[PDB]
Design a protein around this ligand. Structure first.
Ligand SMILES: Nc1ncnc2c1ncn2[C@@H]1O[C@H](COP(=O)(O)OP(=O)(O)OP(=O)(O)O)[C@@H](O)[C@H]1O
Ligand SMILES: Nc1ncnc2c1ncn2[C@@H]1O[C@H](COP(=O)(O)OP(=O)(O)O)[C@@H](O)[C@H]1O
Ligand SMILES: [Mg+2]
Ligand SMILES: [Mg+2]
Lengths: 469, 48, 496, 53
């Protein structure tokens, strides 16, 4: 239907002319036959004039000429939704890539471009979501049905924290999970995430058996990375709308943003700030507002956000920051100091860090830990050149407690046994609060700092110190 | 003791000066790159 | 219809009017004319209306407005196969070593999507670099992308060349894509490879800093296409079919610089640090093709060793962080350790290997866990190494042993060590047998010990190599044999 | 009318004029208006002042 002709091919952007009365819609999908029986499913973005449209390739577009025919499908990119998508690995277009057979035509296909839930649908109910990580469960607690993100640089442990979260919480879900590997690098993803999700057993069913996986990896051209997040959100919204709880892990939202930036550069838009698209905020709103949990069902989102260089003032993470219920900041300085759960407690916040929601003692302990660390950060310049000896006795005690707290936030992970030769350790939120309260009370002042490195609760530190004696 | 402590403080201050000079050079290069990129964007959007 | 004319020659881009029936990445020909005996090619990339912008893979002063151009009808590709071994080639596949034309039967297209996301398997086979520090602390498996990041003149190229040299009988096809390097440096590298006889399994793709901007941008992709040909099909090396390749993108920062100037001369909007917005996509699509395929898709692998040059040890720049976020692990080469005599200046504190720890010989990991732990203890005690014997509760002994291991990790250039020699030396060091050796004479001791293993007891080395894959390495037979060899060497020789 | 009295006092809180300026910059750049500093349009000060006066 509505057969047009390719006019221009600039990168992954294809400008195609169509008849005047049969111009494709704004987000319509158009297929280039490409020969060999396999199509290239471009997605329209703009209408330029007398049947002239601009589309994003969603594919290689590296060996196709001008003048090729383009068949307008008349509908946007439709991906399968339902129980048939559980235990399968999909593309940006919803085509399975695993060895299993294709999705049958009887399965409902939904467009990847849907309106976000309205204001009446929003669910503000918040409660603690225990993760087993001390720094996450204390400083920036997770919200069940709330949006949390793990910002970080390049060498910091973003994928390791995502893997540990999956290993800790995906065995007990009371629902389903969706993993959007947007620019995930395809080695630490399906080569590893899918392998470890088929090894974890939940009542004789693997975690992967109740997990949708959609992978717009780094090798893909910008269009696949630009729409794969929306594909995964469309697949998760079906389970959300029917009441099932959803655990959504989107890895490197910044890859989504970067793909959008490259497409906008090829689309001729005028750039903003450091080469970014003018429509950065609206694109971020379009993806992020569909992630929100509603009254029918809840999505507990855990996104990873790459930070270019180490610049947290970059427009992409800055736009991500305001779309979250919990923020975790990973710092290269902490990671280089071998505190590998390198969460910055002063730069990590959470909305449910309230004495009414999480508890009075939890709130008091977290705020006192942050206050001690802020005092340490203020005295860093004093300690750097004068040394510890010039500080007052209270300041010396505060700095020692802060160093012990910094070392104590480090925790051995089950998925990190190859790096640190220690077994994985799970610490409940109550044990985390009690251990940090005991550390702040004065217990452990006689213990040297090195016994707080890569331990569980305070009882593990005490046991190690008594073993050393 | 004061002599030794102040010698150590002077050495640490020199190291901090070196690190801050590296940071300042990075900041200056980034500022000039941002300025020329903004000027080129504002000029190429109205001429060609 | 496949013939066009140049209507403008600019900053490495020619506009090529009237070239219909050209695909989006053809290699246009520019057939030879008067004053130019050899054809120079170009990539048609901006296929706009009645204009086909093409970047020129060569000097742009040779072509003229009004020149005639023919369309070859194929996406840009490089010759691949057995005939590329032993040849220094242009990123177009043309030979530059003067040994004659390249014989080949197939051309693999550069600029292709990675083998896939299903089509991969976790690394299990190790890559023996021959460096004690790297093979012990930063294991590299076949199919792993291990970045080599450091400052200028820190031994990154030396590390890559030692890694290439060690893959002699290992069934590995090595590729060295020097991007932006000086022609003198590439000539020295090729002379070194020829000196040790590595070139009979090595391909060199040379894109000199003097060469065009379009070159040094397709050079890593040409090398990766050759490596993918090795991965998918394999070649006959040493009489056996090998499907394992190891590629070294020497100085990918210069590759990023070349792509930045290509983009800026194309009037593309700059991003961070004036680089184009798709430089991450550049390096990601380059490195994602280095994979470890499962047995369904061949079982071959392409190890990648990208090289990144930093400025004043700035890990947190744009391109270094891009490549770190793409690659698996990092091998960081300090300038301070390099200038202090630790020539394999491996920053053990920050150099990691996300995968390849499982892709290590069990002997090496069994004898290297203790080495890594004691190096961590030595680094912890480094801040406490300023007290006049105020700490002595085995802390002085721990510092002495850490200095011993650090001196042991010091390795001369162009002398790779076999896995059996590495594990024997590491077992000797980790079983309290070098504690009577003074610090300055450890390395000589190692050399002498290796000689004692090479001449007196080759059967000990053979026994060590035979049971390197056992679940527990120090089996009583090999334990007794290696203990006897170490004690005999300590007896017949001096302390060193 | 409010609680039985005619209130003529109002308190307006623009919770993000940085986001408002970002939205206006997106509008201006999509309209291909000439950029200013940080890609913001020239009349971005005239915008907020017109709102805040
Ligand atoms: N293990 C080593 N033992 C002795 N000398 C070494 C070793 N590694 C490197 N060198 C020496 O260090 C010098 C620089 O090494 P190399 O050229 O490999 O470094 P690079 O980081 O690639 O430098 P460039 O920035 O010039 O490319 C050479 O003189 C080389 O011989
Ligand atoms: N919890 C941890 N324990 C030990 N090492 C860790 C941990 N988290 C991260 N690392 C280190 O970080 C590296 C993985 O970083 P990764 O999270 O993959 O980076 P990215 O942010 O690009 O995903 C590994 O090499 C590992 O050494
Ligand atoms: Mg990651
Ligand atoms: Mg070099």
């Amino acid at each position: 239907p509505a057969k047009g002709v390719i006019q221009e091919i600039i990168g992954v952007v294809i400008r195609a002319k169509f008849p005047e009365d049969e111009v494709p819609e704004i987000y319509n999908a158009i297929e280039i036959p490409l020969g060999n029986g396999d199509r290239l499913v471009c997605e329209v973005q703009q209408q330029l004039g007398n049947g002239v449209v601009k589309a994003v390739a969603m594919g290689s577009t590296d060996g196709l000429r001008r003048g090729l025919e383009v068949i307008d499908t008349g509908r946007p990119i439709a991906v399968p939704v339902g129980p048939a998508t559980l235990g399968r690995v999909f593309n940006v277009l919803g085509d399975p890539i695993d060895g299993m057979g294709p999705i049958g035509p009887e399965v409902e296909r939904r467009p990847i471009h849907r309106d976000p839930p309205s204001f009446e649908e929003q669910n503000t109910q918040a409660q603690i979501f225990e993760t087993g990580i001390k720094v996450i469960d204390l400083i920036a607690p997770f919200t069940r049905g709330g949006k949390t993100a793990i910002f970080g640089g390049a060498g910091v442990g973003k994928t390791v924290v995502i893997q540990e979260l999956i290993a800790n919480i995906a065995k007990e879900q009371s629902g389903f999970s969706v993993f959007a590997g947007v620019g995930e690098r395809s080695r630490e993803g399906n080569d590893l995430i899918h392998e470890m999700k088929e090894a974890r057993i939940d009542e004789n069913t693997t975690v992967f058996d109740k997990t949708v996986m959609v992978f717009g990896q780094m090798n893909e051209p910008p269009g696949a990375r630009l729409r794969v997040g929306l594909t995964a959100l469309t697949m998760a919204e079906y389970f959300r709308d029917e009441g099932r709880d959803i655990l959504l892990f989107i890895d490197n939202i910044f890859r989504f943003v970067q793909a959008g930036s490259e497409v906008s550069s090829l689309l001729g838009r005028m750039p903003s700030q450091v080469g970014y698209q003018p429509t950065l905020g609206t694109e971020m709103g379009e993806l992020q507002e569909r992630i929100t949990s509603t009254k029918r069902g809840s999505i507990t989102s855990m996104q990873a956000v790459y930070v270019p260089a180490d610049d947290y003032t970059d427009p992409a993470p800055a736009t991500v920051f305001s779309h979250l219920d919990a923020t975790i900041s990973l710092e290269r300085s902490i990671a280089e100091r071998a505190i590998f759960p390198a969460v910055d407690p002063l730069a990590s916040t959470s909305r449910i860090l309230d004495p009414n929601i999480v508890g009075e003692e939890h709130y008091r302990v977290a705020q006192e830990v942050k206050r001690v660390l802020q005092r340490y950060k203020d005295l860093k310049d004093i300690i750097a050149i004068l040394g510890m000896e010039e500080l007052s006795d209270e300041d010396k005690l505060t700095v020692q407690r802060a160093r012990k707290i910094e070392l104590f936030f480090s925790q051995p992970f089950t998925v990190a046994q190859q790096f640190t030769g220690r077994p994985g350790k799970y610490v409940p939120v109550k044990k985390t609060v009690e251990s940090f309260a005991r550390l702040l009370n004065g217990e452990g002042d006689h213990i040297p700092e090195s016994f707080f490195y890569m331990q569980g609760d305070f009882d593990d530190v005490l046991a190690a110190y008594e073993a050393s004696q | 003791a004061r002599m030794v402590a102040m010698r150590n403080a002077t050495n640490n201050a020199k190291d901090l000066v070196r690190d801050l000079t590296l940071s300042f050079n990075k900041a200056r290069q980034a500022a000039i790159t941002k300025e020329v990129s903004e000027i080129a964007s504002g000029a190429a959007a109205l001429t060609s | 219809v496949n013939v066009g004319t140049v209507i403008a020659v600019g900053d490495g881009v020619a506009r090529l009017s009237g070239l219909d029936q050209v695909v989006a990445s053809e290699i246009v020909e520019f057939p030879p004319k008067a004053g130019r005996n050899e054809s120079i090619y170009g990539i048609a990339l901006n296929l706009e209306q009645d204009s086909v912008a093409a970047i020129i893979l060569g000097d742009d002063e040779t072509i003229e407005e009004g020149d005639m151009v023919t369309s070859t009808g194929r996406v840009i590709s490089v010759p691949v196969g057995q005939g590329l071994l032993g040849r220094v080639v242009n990123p177009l596949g043309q030979p530059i070593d003067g040994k004659g034309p390249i014989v080949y039967e197939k051309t693999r297209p550069i600029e292709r999507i990675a083998p896939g996301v299903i089509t991969r398997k976790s690394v299990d086979t190790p890559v023996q670099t021959g460096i004690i520090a790297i093979d012990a602390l930063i294991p590299i498996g076949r199919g792993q992308r291990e970045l080599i990041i450091g400052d200028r003149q820190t031994g990154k190229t030396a590390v890559a060349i030692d890694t290439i040299l060690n893959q002699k009988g290992q069934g590995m096809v090595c590729i060295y894509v020097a991007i932006g390097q000086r022609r003198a440096q590439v000539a020295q590298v090729v002379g070194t490879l020829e000196r040790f006889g590595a070139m009979e399994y090595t391909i060199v793709v040379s894109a000199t800093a003097s060469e065009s901007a379009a070159l040094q941008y397709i050079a890593p992709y040409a090398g990766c296409a050759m490596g993918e040909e090795i991965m998918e099909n394999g070649v006959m090396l040493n009489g056996q079919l090998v499907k394992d390749a190891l590629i070294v993108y020497d100085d990918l920062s210069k590759h990023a610089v070349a792509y930045r100037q290509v983009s800026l001369l194309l009037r593309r909007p700059p991003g961070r640090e004036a680089y184009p917005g798709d430089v991450f996509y550049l390096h990601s699509r380059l490195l994602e093709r280095a994979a470890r395929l499962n047995e369904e898709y061949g079982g071959g692998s392409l190890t990648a060793l990208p090289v990144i040059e930093t400025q004043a040890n700035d890990v947190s720049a744009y391109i270094p962080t891009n490549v770190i976020s793409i690659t698996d692990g990092q091998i960081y080469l300090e300038s301070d350790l390099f200038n202090a005599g630790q020539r394999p200046a491996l920053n053990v504190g920050i150099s990691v290997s996300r995968v390849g720890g499982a892709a290590q010989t069990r002997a090496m990991r069994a004898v290297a866990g203790k080495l890594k732990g004691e190096l961590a203890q030595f680094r912890d005690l480094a801040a406490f190494a300023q007290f006049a014997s105020d700490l002595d509760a085995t802390t002085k002994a721990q510092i002495e042993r850490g200095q011993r291991l650090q001196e042991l990790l010091k390795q001369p250039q162009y002398q790779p060590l076999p896995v059996e020699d590495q594990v024997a030396v590491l077992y000797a060091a980790t079983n309290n047998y070098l504690d009577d050796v003074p610090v300055p004479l450890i390395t000589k001791w190692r050399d002498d010990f290796l000689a004692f293993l090479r001449t007196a007891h080759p059967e000990v080395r053979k026994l060590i190599y035979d049971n390197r894959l056992d679940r527990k390495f120090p089996t009583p037979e090999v334990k007794e044999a290696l203990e006897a060899a170490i004690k005999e060497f300590k007896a017949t020789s001096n302390y060193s």
